Amino acid sequence: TTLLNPYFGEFGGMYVPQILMPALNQLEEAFVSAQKDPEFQAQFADLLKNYAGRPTALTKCQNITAGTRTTLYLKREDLLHGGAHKTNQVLGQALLAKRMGKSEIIAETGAGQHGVASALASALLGLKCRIYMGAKDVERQSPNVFRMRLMGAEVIPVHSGSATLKDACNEALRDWSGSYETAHYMLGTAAGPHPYPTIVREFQRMIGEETKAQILDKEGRLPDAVIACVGGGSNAIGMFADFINDTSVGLIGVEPGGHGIETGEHGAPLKHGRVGIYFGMKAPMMQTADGQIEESYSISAGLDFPSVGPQHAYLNSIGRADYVSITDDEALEAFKTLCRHEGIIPALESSHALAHALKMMREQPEKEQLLVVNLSGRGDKDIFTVHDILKARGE
């Protein structure tokens, strides 16, 4: 028995070994209790406001849209403490851990952003944090590893399997199955077994709530569409949640197309993968024909989770949300465009969302449309990546 529905249509569930069920059931009951507790809500709101800097701005981009009938606003998650939206949910999850009497946090990380987010929340809230990161990722993400260690987190390199994100996830879950009485597993996206897709959405939903209020204040009506990149699904579901019932508002999720869908080198499982069961859930994933789990490829390492949150798969299935993809080259062009024309350096993750809005505008420049892009993070972290590409091909 669960308190809440673990599925979104056919997708989701709790496909974990039997021994991990009590941890998931404990978490779910703690969450349900927390959600009804005005003191928990007040404490979470207080951290978001006075520590993380909520509400975040909603910035109009007239320099980009000039001469078209597009109006473009960026939801400025790049201005959140830590430089990406991940901070919102790690703070709620850390509060949940304290609610349950846990004194330790376990987290996984691929590109290091969730690792840093978990570490900063743990440092603030006095939790002992240990982070599993694939040894190959540890090597290609030294700035993020040193941030984690500065913040008092223990960073544990994982050598098992392919020494990347999947292996980190597995090691985190293994640890948790033996330590859940004193440790909380701080999963970094709106995916994995129930209750994590639900929890992470609820702890990100202020993105869309604020966006709604701000767009109503500034324009007097809802957006025609809100657009967000999709790696695992957290920033997109946070933007989308409050608009789901506003049936005239388009929900566009943007997966990484990498070098191009046709090349096979992409990270677009929702639209170009196949449903499997892994990561504790039933969802579209990147996998071989005989069912071995594969990798997602993107210029942006933050978009490389090889599946997708089950609520996204469900929202696509019923036609409520539409999913598209953007290539590396398109994302790079959006990155350069925002730097040059608005003085904002976007994360390469976020640049995928922006690239698709640019496409919406440029393809039909006399179409009246009011767009919000979720600018999920800032791109200081990506400047050497972008520099080296722009160098490699002349410039």
């Binding site: 496909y15 070994p17 039997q18 991990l20 399997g161 597995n170 892994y278 069912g291 071995q292």
Partner: protein
């Protein structure tokens, strides 16, 4: 076929527990894995638990993860695992053969088709490591439709609802993790319990049976002998034969 039922009735007649080794199909290659399995049987294995190499074996420890990696280095696929299974059953008609699977490999080509393939090759049971009893309905239904026993883990902390589900839904044997639980499972008419996890010496096989389990499963200990002897396949087999013989002797009354 009711190979587990036949086995336990014969063992009971002999006042004997089952000894059940776990190995990974195709570790360290197909031909040597076939020889290893035949050696485990010739040394007195009562049943087999066999893993199919999977990319992300979450519920397995380093020894077994390493075994999967060796099997992948040999190019082992599920299709080749099923050809192996057919040959093993053709050589050994009564020994119960159980698979340890991950959900993706069962679900991948269709759950029904998976269990049909198991039936066709003569597998007796399947434990899907990452399907908890609460979400097992389509797996256990498909298993039973194809005369395959669905196997469930019963954790040492299991509450009463979980014990009743396990007792009701499982067949063949109950996978008990390393005396209260054993009596409750018997009370609820569960399939006979086999104790597994960290069983590595004769003394622990005897202890499990004395506690009231029908037998014991051992994997890491066995696969260690594989890993240790990669360079010497012939000695590998001799050490496997010695260890299995000793472990099986500990189950005898």
């Amino acid at each position: 076929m009711e190979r587990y039922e036949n086995l336990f009735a014969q063992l009971n007649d002999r006042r004997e527990g089952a000894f059940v080794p776990f190995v990974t199909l195709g570790d360290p290659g197909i031909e040597q894995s076939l020889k290893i399995i035949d050696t485990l049987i010739d040394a007195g294995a009562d049943a087999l638990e066999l893993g199919v190499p999977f990319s992300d074996p979450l519920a397995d420890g380093p020894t077994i993860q390493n075994a999967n990696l060796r099997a992948f280095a040999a190019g082992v696929t599920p299709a080749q695992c099923f050809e192996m299974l057919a040959l093993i059953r053709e050589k050994h008609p009564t020994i119960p053969i159980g698979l340890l699977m991950y959900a993706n490999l069962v679900f991948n080509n269709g759950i029904d088709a998976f269990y049909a393939r198991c039936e066709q090759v003569g597998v007796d049971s399947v434990l899907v490591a990452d399907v908890p009893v609460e979400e097992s309905a389509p797996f256990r239904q498909a298993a039973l439709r194809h005369n395959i026993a669905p196997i469930f883990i019963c954790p040492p902390n299991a509450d009463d609802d979980l014990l009743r589900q396990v007792a009701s839904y499982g067949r063949g044997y109950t996978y008990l993790l390393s005396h209260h639980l054993i009596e409750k499972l018997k009370e609820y008419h569960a399939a006979p319990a086999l104790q597994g996890f960290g069983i590595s010496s004769p003394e622990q096989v005897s202890a499990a049976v004395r506690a009231g389990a029908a037998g014991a499963i051992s994997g890491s200990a066995i696969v260690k002998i594989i890993e240790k002897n990669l360079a010497s396949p012939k000695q590998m087999l001799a050490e496997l034969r010695s260890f299995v013989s000793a472990m099986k002797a500990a189950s005898r009354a």
